[PDB]
Subunit: 318 residues, 3 copies
Amino acid sequence: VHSVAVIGAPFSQGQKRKGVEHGPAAIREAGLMKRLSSLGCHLKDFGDLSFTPVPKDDLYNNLIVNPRSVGLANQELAEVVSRAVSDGYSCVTLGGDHSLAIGTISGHARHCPDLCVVWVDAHADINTPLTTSSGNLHGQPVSFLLRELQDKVPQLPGFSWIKPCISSASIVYIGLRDVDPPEHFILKNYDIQYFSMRDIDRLGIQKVMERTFDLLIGKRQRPIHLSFDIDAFDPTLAPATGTPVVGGLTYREGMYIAEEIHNTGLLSALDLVEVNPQLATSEEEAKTTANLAVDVIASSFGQTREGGHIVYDQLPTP
Amino acid sequence: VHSVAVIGAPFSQGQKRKGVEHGPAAIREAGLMKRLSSLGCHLKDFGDLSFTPVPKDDLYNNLIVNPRSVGLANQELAEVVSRAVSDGYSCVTLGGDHSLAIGTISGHARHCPDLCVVWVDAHADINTPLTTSSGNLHGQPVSFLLRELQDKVPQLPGFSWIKPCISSASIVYIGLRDVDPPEHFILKNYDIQYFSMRDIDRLGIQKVMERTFDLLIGKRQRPIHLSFDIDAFDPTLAPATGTPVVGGLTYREGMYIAEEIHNTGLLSALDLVEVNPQLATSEEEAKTTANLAVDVIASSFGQTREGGHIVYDQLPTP
Amino acid sequence: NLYFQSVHSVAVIGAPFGVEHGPAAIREAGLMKRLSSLGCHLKDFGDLLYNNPRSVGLANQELAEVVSRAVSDGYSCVTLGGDHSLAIGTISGHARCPDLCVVWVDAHADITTSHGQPVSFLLRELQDKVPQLPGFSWIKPCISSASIVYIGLRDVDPPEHFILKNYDIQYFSMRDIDRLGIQKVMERTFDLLIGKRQRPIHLSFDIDAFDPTLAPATGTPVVGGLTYREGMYIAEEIHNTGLLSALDLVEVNPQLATSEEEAKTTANLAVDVIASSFGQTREGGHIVYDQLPTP
Ligand SMILES: NC[C@@H](CCC[B-](O)(O)O)[C@H](N)C(=O)O
Ligand SMILES: [Mn+2]
Ligand SMILES: [Mn+2]
Ligand SMILES: [Mn+2]
Ligand SMILES: [Mn+2]
Ligand SMILES: [Mn+2]
Ligand SMILES: [Mn+2]
């Protein structure tokens, strides 16, 4: 019996495309709670958080957009995640853009300092505020969290509260296929392990999961933080997303990652981000993406493709 | 060269979605007979059976749907299949819902004491009339056929003619992804071998086919009954079906299963079920599903990806 | 960007043999910009019955002399199609490099006929089986049986199957990829073609080798093709040898598109294959970043 807390983080200021703030409601509408309930989960829904707005919030170094707004909302979200983690709940945060991982990972690390991160995404999201070309904070969350990158990251307004909480050996990426040249340099120079789409093509997702766990939990059991960007899946499967990139995970591969995460029994927090129902060309495309998000979450807590989630031990007789 | 019999079974009373009775007409219209002719098949067309309706056949024990109609249609179907097999043909039955495997497998076992079954489906179709939640008989056919379950299956009206004819070690499932808790218990408890979509994700379809044949025909040659539900394919490939489940077989995997079955030279009967042209959103969706059904059957009788079905003896010289 | 993992010299030619709208569709999808972004030294050449053997044979003679000039100057020649018949011209022109090996990526063997016969005119062992066509006398066979490897085969005609089987032409059909996986297929392909010695590689890529969901705007689409990932993998491994000498990107037919999304997706895919053949990858790393800025 897993105790699962659901937190809606209708965060959109980490990027420029509107509608990602409607991701939590779309996921709940696709039957998230009914699905987790059927798995036997003990649920708590915090509903959607109302983040303190920052009306006077100008560009940092004439590039970084909404720093105070993103920094403050993450500060507040980190308090909610920390509380849920303290109360014994596996914390599911529904996005919202991927800048929310600053708050969920920060919050989680307060009570789980030995956590490890499995980052599932088409993107590395590891640009520093000095390497970003877009100035979108959803493309930089990992830079604020990485201990080894601290001397390369300037102090941004609203971001001072953040204490880097993950080391380069404690994060593994899966699904990479659109990596900026500064991000590629960071991954190689700081020895951050990753399994790009090319590594999945060669090894197969089973070997990718085995190797990920060898790297992270090969020495001891640790709390796992699964940060899952819906754009890790091929755009044909997850169209309702801001930055789609062709040649992503199949439905089967995404289910396989989540099932392996469930099988460890170590999942402590999960982010499901970048579902933007507004970017779907049709209502069915929006529902398809939202149904996929529920499937990743439910598989992370026991949903299988073999029907082995529920205890059944005796057949009825005539 | 193969002797192949074709039987149309326009039957829908094993489920609640209207239209699956039009599956045989849709498959025939897709050019099935012309395709089998082009492969050099000696063909016998038994036409499309008209099933004796049961006007008074309502809900049994507040659960079982249409038992008298399903039992009778299967009794009639078993006699036609028995005729085709005893005449010496490899029996192709076009569905119609998956409750029709009661008739095809019963009819086939009347001549093949050592028959084995390869069941390709998103579903196990092995609930008993006591474990079913829906009461739909297309989700229960294997329970009536399996010897090990005889003491778990109640006597339904119209089912007294059925004799269990297969052992738990004589059926292998491929493609499973939507299994009920009692069905998972039955599969594990009785040691029925299955390769779910997760097993295919891990092993690959080559190893799945090798292991299937090792389990079934590794000790001795045996007639093979291929019970193929079109919903084993991903819904993007087979949209015109009643219970679609995302994350199915690819076109390539489906053809590979069919090619490997052909390569044994032991195919004795094939069911191609659950094509429901009415559930397609367009004519092209219905046609794609029908064409896929024809490709499975043709590959099961020799159609290949390398174009080696037709023998070429001499190249023209100048 | 000033630093790159590798610098290649690349020549681009448009051969519009609605398949004629193919080179224009590829160009409009930003091909030149993409190759420039990879640190390539670019040279754009612009856009150029028996039993149309004259017109096909003529257009191919112009293409073969343009390809021969580009490869003579030391450029890796890229030809935008147009139908696959242009491969007679490009492989002949490139051969004028005699020890060239071919990697034919197609749903079809293109090798008795009923764009489906280019390999018959080029293969040495098939010379005593091919008749003297009008405006085809200038062609001499250049590639032997053990120098062409097919990848992606799924629609092979009975006389083609006999040719492949009896002339011992090694191939990896869709069924072979299903069994081995694309990694093993590339490892085995290179074991066959360059295991003995290094050789200029001719990659003739038909867009229909990919599944029709990915490349819908093509002439002869065949279901159950290569995924986007498999095709990129082929191109990346070809790049990783450091031997790519010529490449054809054929059968993009923008007049067969039933929507703008089907038109743009097919052209974008064709740009992706070419870019991956000259260094573009899923991991990045093609562009070399020196140092991180400090606050
Ligand atoms: N959720 C699927 C269904 C069975 C589908 C039968 B099939 O489509 O395979 O024929 C369920 N287990 C049931 O018992 O009603
Ligand atoms: Mn992300
Ligand atoms: Mn992303
Ligand atoms: Mn079925
Ligand atoms: Mn089924
Ligand atoms: Mn071709
Ligand atoms: Mn082709």
